[PDB]
Write an enzyme that holds these catalytic residues in place. Structure first.
Site, PDB file in Angstrom:
ATOM      1  N   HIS A  78      57.261 -31.550  -5.276  1.00  0.00           N
ATOM      2  CA  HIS A  78      58.205 -31.073  -6.110  1.00  0.00           C
ATOM      3  C   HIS A  78      59.575 -30.979  -5.420  1.00  0.00           C
ATOM      4  CE1 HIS A  78      54.508 -30.045  -8.286  1.00  0.00           C
ATOM      5  NE2 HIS A  78      55.180 -30.061  -9.482  1.00  0.00           N
ATOM      6  N   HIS A  82      61.353 -36.353  -7.086  1.00  0.00           N
ATOM      7  CA  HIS A  82      60.573 -36.074  -8.470  1.00  0.00           C
ATOM      8  C   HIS A  82      61.412 -35.768  -9.361  1.00  0.00           C
ATOM      9  CE1 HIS A  82      57.488 -34.660 -11.242  1.00  0.00           C
ATOM     10  NE2 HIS A  82      58.277 -33.515 -11.164  1.00  0.00           N
TER      11      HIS A  82
HETATM   12  C1  LIG Z   1      44.040 -33.658 -12.021  1.00  0.00           C
HETATM   13  O1  LIG Z   1      44.901 -34.049 -10.825  1.00  0.00           O
HETATM   14  C2  LIG Z   1      44.660 -33.383  -9.653  1.00  0.00           C
HETATM   15  C3  LIG Z   1      43.878 -32.407  -9.355  1.00  0.00           C
HETATM   16  C4  LIG Z   1      43.702 -31.580  -8.325  1.00  0.00           C
HETATM   17  C5  LIG Z   1      44.242 -32.260  -7.293  1.00  0.00           C
HETATM   18  C6  LIG Z   1      45.295 -33.085  -7.397  1.00  0.00           C
HETATM   19  C7  LIG Z   1      45.542 -33.905  -8.483  1.00  0.00           C
HETATM   20  C8  LIG Z   1      46.287 -35.214  -8.554  1.00  0.00           C
HETATM   21  O2  LIG Z   1      46.676 -35.176  -9.736  1.00  0.00           O
HETATM   22  C9  LIG Z   1      48.201 -34.931 -10.009  1.00  0.00           C
HETATM   23  C10 LIG Z   1      48.356 -33.691 -10.796  1.00  0.00           C
HETATM   24  C11 LIG Z   1      49.737 -33.274 -11.031  1.00  0.00           C
HETATM   25  C12 LIG Z   1      49.929 -32.023 -11.577  1.00  0.00           C
HETATM   26  N1  LIG Z   1      48.967 -31.307 -11.659  1.00  0.00           N
HETATM   27  N2  LIG Z   1      48.825 -29.987 -12.532  1.00  0.00           N
HETATM   28  C13 LIG Z   1      47.700 -29.621 -12.857  1.00  0.00           C
HETATM   29  C14 LIG Z   1      46.491 -30.553 -13.747  1.00  0.00           C
HETATM   30  C15 LIG Z   1      45.194 -30.223 -14.118  1.00  0.00           C
HETATM   31  N3  LIG Z   1      44.450 -29.292 -13.094  1.00  0.00           N
HETATM   32  C16 LIG Z   1      43.289 -29.724 -12.578  1.00  0.00           C
HETATM   33  C17 LIG Z   1      42.465 -28.878 -11.742  1.00  0.00           C
HETATM   34  C18 LIG Z   1      41.041 -29.079 -11.613  1.00  0.00           C
HETATM   35  C19 LIG Z   1      40.654 -30.182 -12.342  1.00  0.00           C
HETATM   36  N4  LIG Z   1      39.184 -30.649 -12.281  1.00  0.00           N
HETATM   37  C20 LIG Z   1      39.141 -31.424 -13.287  1.00  0.00           C
HETATM   38  C21 LIG Z   1      40.409 -31.684 -13.762  1.00  0.00           C
HETATM   39  N5  LIG Z   1      40.737 -32.571 -14.982  1.00  0.00           N
HETATM   40  O3  LIG Z   1      40.717 -33.761 -14.742  1.00  0.00           O
HETATM   41  O4  LIG Z   1      40.940 -32.185 -15.818  1.00  0.00           O
HETATM   42  N6  LIG Z   1      41.224 -30.714 -13.336  1.00  0.00           N
HETATM   43  N7  LIG Z   1      42.633 -30.507 -13.537  1.00  0.00           N
HETATM   44  C22 LIG Z   1      45.384 -28.362 -12.178  1.00  0.00           C
HETATM   45  C23 LIG Z   1      46.655 -29.218 -11.721  1.00  0.00           C
HETATM   46  C24 LIG Z   1      50.217 -29.206 -12.610  1.00  0.00           C
HETATM   47  O5  LIG Z   1      49.732 -28.161 -12.927  1.00  0.00           O
HETATM   48  C25 LIG Z   1      51.136 -30.183 -12.875  1.00  0.00           C
HETATM   49  C26 LIG Z   1      52.475 -29.531 -12.699  1.00  0.00           C
HETATM   50  C27 LIG Z   1      53.346 -30.471 -13.485  1.00  0.00           C
HETATM   51  C28 LIG Z   1      52.975 -31.577 -14.105  1.00  0.00           C
HETATM   52  C29 LIG Z   1      51.907 -32.228 -13.308  1.00  0.00           C
HETATM   53  C30 LIG Z   1      51.287 -31.515 -12.114  1.00  0.00           C
HETATM   54  C31 LIG Z   1      50.666 -34.309 -10.634  1.00  0.00           C
HETATM   55  C32 LIG Z   1      50.596 -35.468 -10.031  1.00  0.00           C
HETATM   56  C33 LIG Z   1      49.294 -35.733  -9.733  1.00  0.00           C
HETATM   57  O6  LIG Z   1      49.010 -36.865  -9.068  1.00  0.00           O
HETATM   58  C34 LIG Z   1      49.971 -37.976  -8.787  1.00  0.00           C
HETATM   59 MG   LIG Z   2      57.185 -28.297 -13.132  1.00  0.00          MG
HETATM   60 ZN   LIG Z   3      57.987 -31.793 -12.347  1.00  0.00          ZN
END
Ligand SMILES: COc1ccccc1COc1cc(C2=NN(C3CCN(c4ccc5ncc([N+](=O)[O-])n5n4)CC3)C(=O)[C@H]3CCCC[C@H]23)ccc1OC
Ligand SMILES: [Mg+2]
Ligand SMILES: [Zn+2]
EC number: 3.1.4.53
Length: 329
Positions: A78, A82
């Site tokens: 961030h 980005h």
């Molecule tokens: C799912 O990807 C993960 C998860 C953990 C670690 C790394 C990533 C890599 O992916 C990337 C995520 C992001 C962002 N992420 N998040 C959320 C996404 C949903 N979320 C979970 C938590 C737990 C879980 N278990 C199953 C699922 N599922 O698949 O449904 N989940 N989703 C919490 C975090 C933000 O708040 C955003 C701020 C603004 C825009 C986008 C940001 C950006 C670039 C990424 O990759 C380049």
């Molecule tokens: Mg944001």
């Molecule tokens: Zn952003």
């Protein structure tokens, strides 16, 4: 009166601004870590926004440099790169043929300006983290869209620094309309609005009217703003739709940031956060989930809305998803 060679090489990379998959990390290097400034500047010139809105050029540069300086360099994901990427992605989305001549310059400017400020002064940790640590930002914003309220307030406040008011020649009507659009777009970058935004975008495609030739009709604020909101949100979730060299870099950087939040949750930890541990939970499965439940349902629905304009982007998204899958034992 003529550019330096670093400046030339930078000008040549910047010829890719209208294309998905710009070498944004390279621009960051070539710009001396000024990708948000050089890209916003390039976009404003190409879209004629300086003439349209009577923005003095020195004021734009001053604001942009100030803005870029309140993005943190010690945050891996961030940061200003980005911001730059999201600006440039939103810029491309706006030129999609299905939206040709749909939006006004004030709408375009709101979409772009929003993209530029949308993560300003991001501390490298999540809303939930800020809330659970009883942090000042969470207390100030009464626990709701903490980061997103913060980014808006900083972005707007910086307009008040010396020679930073880029909107100084807009009328009050324009400024009120711009301000509102920018607030609505940035608040929509909170992932807890994802499901509602997506529902509302699916509903729109169900009922999708069309103009004289293939171009969408949006006859009220509620729809126009919905589209701009989902547009910038798409851009913010665009990493997996980029060439893989780009996507892998973004993944590394998100993983660093999230592992670092992990390491800041050992003492406190208020107990580990979702799949952020080297101990357990693959990076690869995490990308596969991200793409399956969030990123693809959005881009697919966006792609119907603008059909066939987004096929290539969706193809790349699907290739990248198969690549990450194939790397799992
Ligand atoms: C799912 O990807 C993960 C998860 C953990 C670690 C790394 C990533 C890599 O992916 C990337 C995520 C992001 C962002 N992420 N998040 C959320 C996404 C949903 N979320 C979970 C938590 C737990 C879980 N278990 C199953 C699922 N599922 O698949 O449904 N989940 N989703 C919490 C975090 C933000 O708040 C955003 C701020 C603004 C825009 C986008 C940001 C950006 C670039 C990424 O990759 C380049
Ligand atoms: Mg944001
Ligand atoms: Zn952003």
């Amino acid at each position: 009166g003529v550019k330096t060679e670093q400046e030339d090489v930078l000008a040549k990379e910047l010829e890719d601004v209208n294309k998905w998959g710009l070498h944004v990390f390279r621009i960051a290097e070539l710009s001396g870590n000024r990708p948000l400034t050089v890209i916003m500047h390039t976009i404003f010139q190409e879209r004629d926004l300086l003439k349209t809105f009577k923005i003095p050029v020195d004021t734009l540069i001053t604001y942009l440099m100030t803005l870029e300086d309140h993005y943190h360099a010690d945050v891996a994901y961030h940061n200003n790169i980005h911001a730059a990427d999201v600006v440039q992605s939103t810029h491309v989305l706006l030129s999609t043929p299905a939206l040709e001549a749909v939006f006004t310059d004030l709408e375009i400017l709101a979409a772009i300006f929003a993209s530029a400020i949308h993560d300003v002064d991001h501390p490298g940790v999540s809303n939930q983290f800020l809330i659970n640590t009883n942090s000042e930002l969470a207390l100030m914003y009464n626990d709701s869209s903490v980061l997103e309220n913060h980014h808006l307030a900083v972005g707007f406040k910086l307009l008040q620094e010396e020679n930073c008011d880029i909107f100084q020649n807009l009328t009050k009507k324009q400024r009120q309309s711009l301000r509102k659009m920018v607030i609505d777009i940035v608040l929509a970058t909170d992932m807890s609005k994802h499901m509602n935004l997506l529902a509302d975008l699916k509903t729109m495609v169900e009922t999708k009217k069309v103009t004289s030739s293939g171009v969408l009709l949006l006859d009220n604020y509620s729809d126009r703003i919905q589209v701009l909101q989902n547009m910038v949100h798409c851009a913010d979730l665009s990493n997996p739709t980029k060439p893989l060299q780009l996507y892998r870099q973004w993944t590394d950087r998100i993983m660093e940031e999230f592992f670092r939040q992990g390491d800041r949750e050992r003492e406190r930890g208020m107990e580990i956060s979702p799949m952020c541990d080297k101990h357990n939970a693959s990076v690869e499965k995490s990308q596969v989930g991200f793409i399956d439940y969030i990123v693809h349902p959005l881009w697919e629905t966006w792609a119907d809305l603008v059909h066939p304009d987004a096929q290539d982007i969706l193809d790349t998204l699907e290739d990248n998803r198969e690549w990450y899958q194939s790397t799992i034992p």
